[PDB]
A paper describes a structure:
structures of the Mep2 transceptors from S. cerevisiae and C. albicans. function as ammonium receptors/sensors in fungal development. a central channel for the transport of ammonium. non-phosphorylated, with channels that are closed on the cytoplasmic side.
structure of the ‘single D' S453D mutant. The channels of phosphorylation-mimicking mutants of C.
Residue numbers in the entry:
A (entry chain A), B (entry chain A), C (entry chain A): 4 to 427, 431 to 455
The structure:
């Protein structure tokens, strides 16, 4: 009388909760709340790190992104990823507006559809604020909200379906992605790169010549953002087992250790490159790099290897940030360097260090990586990383270029039509300017001449 | 040997934990921690939104309210609501100072008394900081603490008993209030209105004529407060099932969606009313309106109806804020508009959209609302809303007026006796003024002439 | 086939999770996340309370301490406390780099080693930021990180083993320490005192003569730190049962009530001592005092006695702060007064109020304290308090003095060699100075003349 389809059965005839371990459900419910607070974590981080004055407050934009993402997910985002009648590349509209989303075992069988919807919806929201942060410079809010809705639909949801969907081709191939390093981090990173290369300011003074690599808008925002991110990451990674087993807590140990060693590695790198100074910004970026790096691996690799997921992503991401000076582009490039490069590196190394005896902690069966002489695992990881980066960069490019040719949907005004943050007899007046007291978004204005 | 009364049994003879599902207990324990952080959430929100400089820091006052509320609840607050020998209108002193509060099944049978005490005590504390926030302008701290203790005792505890107590008359009548929209939001809102009409400043310059509707003290405090509130609301609503069932996670999906759609609706409303600007304050107030609106409904209504609990409260509360300009009163009116009006609207609409098949997700039995052609449900909701508003407004009025006639308990000094924030030879001196560095409350001083 | 040693068994032959209640594991996993956010809680608290401008940002230093502590714990910290082949005074290197830490029942049998490692590692990190905060004035970061690593190894880990280890002598003697009042609070407090007496500035102008007792750097940081601490303390104390029983929720009620009554008591004390003012700093310090006080007792004492663990530590710690004016030393003394004195007082009073019927709520067997006419319990508590204070003060002294004689490991430069916060032709230049925008630690510089 448990149907396994639709709502899962008739609530007046069966107790749909009997299909699940109650403790499994509580941990995934708790983990969903933890991921939610990562959303303002992202907004605080990238507002504080910025080397220029964004007119849009990214702390506030995180709440905007939480609203847009939750509506998109309810509307059809959840269905396009986690419908049960998917087609290798995408889901369907079977769960449009969460129709019949209730007590059937989800793609992750240990939790019902409705709880998996709550949990996975937080991942989409985290990705939404990463994208708004990447593309925030001189953004117009109306076009940005439309962009987020579309981008979640045709960039996030296909990549997420490939990684997590019932018939997703990356699942079937054998690619490993424990907590969504592809859909969340690598995807947003390479979409950010599309923003940088197509819409970011060229020959940017903050990135041109010998300018300071770190010039933060607000160190206290960076620290608070990193606090929220690390705190929430326990749900992000620890919840990706779908259960209450000790593999969940194993993945939390790996998460903590990769962040710790990433933070120390990046700071040590900067200590050598500067000739002896201690980078406060660097420690935080290094913790994020390690957190990103361990994301595809946390439930698959032995604890002692988690330090490598801090060390190696921190080193590589540290040097990836230097490319901003070569391109002379700042906009969007921090998100690409931490999440795009970091996610690529972590996904790659999961193919090296994944171990079948770690997955088996809760009975999960995998062939393993190079730890289990499963050599082609590395090739499965590279196939996933290249497909994510290619789809994300290409489709995000198309979206941005299409909207740029529609004057009322142009996300970022062209320089020749831009007007200095003015406000609506014969003279005009300024509406300054202090985001701490201004109740309205300082929206870019188009020139009327 | 499980007695079901007093402590529940002898700990040396029985394992009182065997009466409960351990996972049910863990979720309610976690949900209690989540509600606790809503307390500073309220303080940050109303400090940041204020159109005038409150001498009392509401972020700090939230910690004060957490202290006063926890002591009151232990003293007799818990007993007056959740004693097992209640009388239709109030509990008793049987659990004075938490005497014999341990392992008997609480009014919510899935958790023991001691855990239900922890959980429900957080609701009283949230209500306490809502009240301190409503009445904070020019408040004297001593009188305010006394006021909170008394107000929790004779306003909150009776209303909470009616809504949740074992023999509460609203329970017996069939009124629905999932997570305490009456005791927390509608109650504090209409008590705030009593403060506005009796003690708030009249002909207030910030509310007189064509003044800006939004003029926030601190947008970053508003955003941080909204972060804490939304984050904590998952425990507030999700924990109100009393269990680990998937109806808990259903209610979290409803909570997230109502907040999202409320935030977007309020911002869209302001976009039309302003002629095209994006209100940063408005998005946050709209999320709160949706969170308040869904509170009586989250575990009773189908997911697709949760968007209505964002849209409709956001529209109505947006226009309710305009009444500050008609009365020319600012003090206390934001709390009334969001929690009083929002809670009334949400409680009303629960009678329309409550569905027996949603309650049945965990075996809870209800007749339903208009969704189940149970037409008189709407009348049960209006009976509860009118009783809460009438009791809260009337008794809060009486408390405020009584204390106003006692010079050492007067909460707010009269203008003729007030003295400009001075400090204790022949000349007097100022003690400025910066709440960031002043270690003492800037307490109003009575004129000695 | 459950071995109870090493990894606990073969994951390919047995399900190691079957040895544990899943709900017990979820609560301890959640409690671990809660303790983690106490780490920045400490950093915010002591940065905001400071009566002088620390060059090191303690909010940021909390992230540094989280990194150093997590690596030390993985390296050998966990093994030195919780290896299964311990020797009365210390553990071993059997679990070096978390080797074979998996599914054997930990010293707390209701959870496996890997989860107990995650949980107890957060306690070590909280202690690390308490120590960095105590010794932060004019600290050099390199030496400070080395100091933290060494101090965790030879001060924290022995004291923790005595209190919690399988063969720890304080366990065997019968000393009670529910949530680590000795290892975390009393230990860091008396190590802080060693910093004060050996390295703190003497005849300090902020502590000399009739200077203000409270002169906070940032009240908003104090409040935010206290928010994080109280919020996280639910995991700190509530998780120390190791299980999902209602004794966990009993301990949360005690925790909340001690904080509430501590906050009110300290503020009332200052109200009398000042002649009528309301101390905003005092309320927060009082909540911390009550939280510290209840830490050794929360799962052992009846609820109505928890108010005494707020009142008595708040009074005594309030007067302990006055000793800064007698010594004319400020550096490190707040940590000693709140955690050293508070932890001593709480540990003492646990011997008075511990009750066997409270421990028996989850089947834990103890003789009790004076509540059960077990008179020698008080002597067991004093033996633990004196051993912790003596070991912590003495070994911390030795570490600080040894490093002070090694010029590249000197934590705090001597005044004759110190140079005013300068930066690396013929003239030198300043690198000001604003921690909100400076991406580098303002590291003390040694004089080159
Ligand atoms: C910010 C703008 C917000 C716009 C969001 C749009 C909100 C409303 C979307 C309408 O969606 C459908 O409405 C139907 C009814 O109107 C539902 O059918 C329902 O019909 C029967 C009862 O009405 C039930 O038995 C069915 O299970 C149930 O699917 C259906 O589920 C739901 O998908
Ligand atoms: C299915 C996709 C449909 C669109 C296909 C068009 C592809 C053409 C190749 C790229 O063309 C360039 O794209 C830029 C980006 O649009 C334009 O820069 C313009 O737009 C940039 C982004 O706003 C600004 O930085 C520049 O100032 C401004 O010249 C630029 O003129 C245009 O030659
Ligand atoms: C498609 C990818 C298949 C490449 C060839 O297959 C294997 O690749 C590894 C390439 O590294 C070799 O292991 C080699 O490299 C490993 C690196 O860890 C070592 O552990 C092994 O001892 C060493 O034989 C291994 O011999 C070889 O058959
Ligand atoms: C900020 C100011 C703080 C003021 C708060 C007041 C704190 C003390 C209140 C006293 O409350 C009563 O004290 C009795 C003892 O003194 C307890 O009886 C107790 O008596 C026996 C043991 O003493 C037990 O078997 C009983 O169960 C137990 O109820 C009783 O429970 C408790 O309600
Ligand atoms: C059981 C209840 C016992 C009390 C019953 C008294 C009811 C009388 C009806 C209302 O009376 C008014 O109440 C106001 C509020 O008290 C007073 O305003 C006074 O108090 C206000 C609040 O502080 C200030 O705004 C005004 O300046 C100040 O005139 C006002 O004088 C008084 O005529
Ligand atoms: C005490 C309150 C009792 C009022 C009268 O009872 C019912 O009230 C509804 C008033 O709305 C009517 O439904 C009417 O209104 C509903 C609104 O949803 C519709 O669904 C129904 O089709 C429509 O018959 C219904 O006929 C009527 O018996
Ligand atoms: C910031 C600087 C970071 C420095 C931190 C140092 C990180 C690496 C430490 C090496 O630790 C050991 O490495 C061995 C292998 O290299 C492991 O043996 C392993 O050997 C077999 C597989 O290799 C397994 O069956 C064993 O269980 C397993 O203990 C062993 O566990 C582990 O303790
Ligand atoms: C196994 C332990 C090995 C070391 C044993 C040495 C024990 C000697 C007893 C204490 O000696 C004093 O220690 C202080 C602390 O070192 C020194 O103050 C020096 O160091 C202080 C801390 O930096 C500064 O405040 C002072 O300016 C500076 O004179 C001081 O000269 C020295 O007489
Ligand atoms: C080693 C410590 C042993 C000291 C002597 O032993 C007991 O100590 C208590 C010292 O207080 C006495 O109780 C006395 O003090 C208690 C304080 O609560 C009271 O409850 C008792 O009634 C009262 O007999 C008690 O008689 C005495 O045998």
């Amino acid at each position: 009388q448990f149907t396994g389809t639709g709502t899962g059965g008739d609530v007046f005839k069966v107790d749909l909760n009997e299909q699940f371990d109650r403790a499994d459900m509580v941990w995934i419910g708790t983990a969903s709340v933890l991921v939610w607070i990562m959303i303002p974590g992202v907004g605080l981080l990238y507002s504080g790190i910025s080397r220029k004055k964004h007119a849009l407050s990214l702390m506030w934009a995180a709440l905007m992104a939480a609203c847009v993402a939750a509506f998109q997910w309810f509307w059809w985002g959840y269905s396009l990823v986690f419908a049960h009648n998917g087609s290798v590349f995408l889901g369907t509209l079977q769960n449009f507006c969460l129709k019949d989303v209730l007590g059937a075992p989800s793609i992750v069988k240990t939790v019902p559809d409705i709880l998996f919807c709550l949990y996975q919806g937080m991942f989409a929201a985290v990705t939404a604020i990463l994208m708004a942060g990447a593309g925030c410079e001189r953004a117009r809010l109306g076009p940005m909200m439309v962009f987020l809705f579309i981008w979640l639909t045709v960039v996030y949801c296909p990549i997420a379906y490939w990684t997590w969907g019932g018939n997703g081709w990356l699942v079937s191939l054998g690619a490993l992605d424990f907590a969504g390093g592809g859909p969340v981090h690598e995807n947003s990173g390479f979409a950010a790169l599309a923003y940088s290369l197509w819409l970011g300011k060229r020959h940017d003074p903050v990135a041109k010549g010998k300018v300071p690599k770190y010039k933060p808008h607000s160190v206290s925002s960076i620290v608070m953002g990193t606090i929220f991110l690390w705190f929430g990451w326990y749900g992000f990674n620890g919840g990706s087992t779908g259960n209450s087993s000790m593999r969940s807590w194993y993945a939390c140990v790996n998460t903590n250790l990769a962040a710790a060693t990433g933070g120390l590695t990046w700071m040590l790198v900067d200590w050598f490159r500067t000739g002896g100074k201690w980078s406060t910004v660097g420690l935080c970026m290094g913790a994020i790099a390690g957190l990103v790096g361990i994301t595809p691996a946390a439930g698959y690799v032995p604890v002692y290897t988690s330090v490598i997921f801090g060390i190696v992503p921190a080193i590589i991401c540290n040097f990836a940030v230097d490319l901003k000076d070569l391109l002379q582009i700042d906009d969007g490039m921090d998100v690409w360097a931490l999440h795009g490069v970091g996610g690529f590196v972590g996904n790659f190394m999961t193919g090296l260090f994944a171990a079948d005896y770690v997955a088996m902690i809760d009975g999960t069966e995998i062939d393993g990586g190079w730890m289990n002489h499963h050599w082609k695992q590395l090739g499965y990881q590279l196939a996933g990383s290249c497909a994510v980066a290619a789809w994300s960069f290409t489709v995000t490019s198309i979206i941005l270029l299409a909207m740029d040719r529609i004057p009322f949907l142009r996300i970022r005004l062209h320089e020749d039509e831009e007007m200095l943050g003015t406000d609506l007899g014969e003279y005009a007046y300024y509406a300054d300017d202090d985001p701490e007291t201004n109740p309205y978004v300082l929206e870019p204005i188009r020139d009327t001449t």
